[PDB]
Amino acid sequence: QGQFEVELKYRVKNHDAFLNMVKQIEHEVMFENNQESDWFYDTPQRTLTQQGKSLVLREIQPAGIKLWIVKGPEADRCEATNITKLDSAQSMLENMGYEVIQCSKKIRSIFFVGEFHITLDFLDGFGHFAEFAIMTDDETALARYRERLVALAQQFHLSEADREHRSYKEILSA
């Protein structure tokens, strides 16, 4: 569980329905209905963005989860580490020459089903979204996880037609 995260995003048109579904499934809960704030960073010339990378500081309340994240360049590469002082992290990145190129808020819920993660998000105005994923270190099993992920997705009655390819930041820059 690390550097390689396969993730499928879906549009969810029915919350309680989706909820009822997981409601009828054996699962662990990381947290429900927290507010997640994300701060995306980059240099003045947008160097990270030109290289297919994203740098993010993230805080989830009231769970109190705070992360320093870097995604890319590889399609499935994602690294992170928990941090205790979000403000210090923000201040250090600016001192490092970085600037917030985007900030965002959303209500989020994350559940566990085996080693797979289920994320349910709600963007005020655009609707509910769902993410299914698993982070692994072995990259050979990255096409087979992508499948059990689809399998799991199928359990919630979500078809490829429900698949959402536009990413959070990747879109609602709109």
Which residues are near a copy of itself by CB under 8 A? 2-3, 47-48, 53, 55, 68-70, 72-73, 79-86, 88-89, 91-92, 95-97
**Minimum CB distance to a copy of itself, residue 161 (Å):** 34
CB nearer a copy of itself, residue 89 or residue 149: 89
What residue type is 136 in one-letter code?
A: T
**Minimum CB distance to a copy of itself, residue 57 (Å):** 10
CB nearer a copy of itself, residue 24 or residue 81: 81
Residue whose entry in the numeric block shows the structure tokens 């993010």: 56
CB nearer a copy of itself, residue 19 or residue 70: 70
**Minimum CB distance to a copy of itself, residue 60 (Å):** 15
Decide: helix, strand or coil at residue 138. Answer: coil
CB nearer a copy of itself, residue 70 or residue 141: 70
Q: How far is CA 132 from CA 44, 51, 113, 160, in A?
A: 34, 26, 10, 13
Q: How far is CA 160 from CA 13, 116, 138, in A?
A: 14, 19, 26
8 Å CB contact between 10 and 164: yes
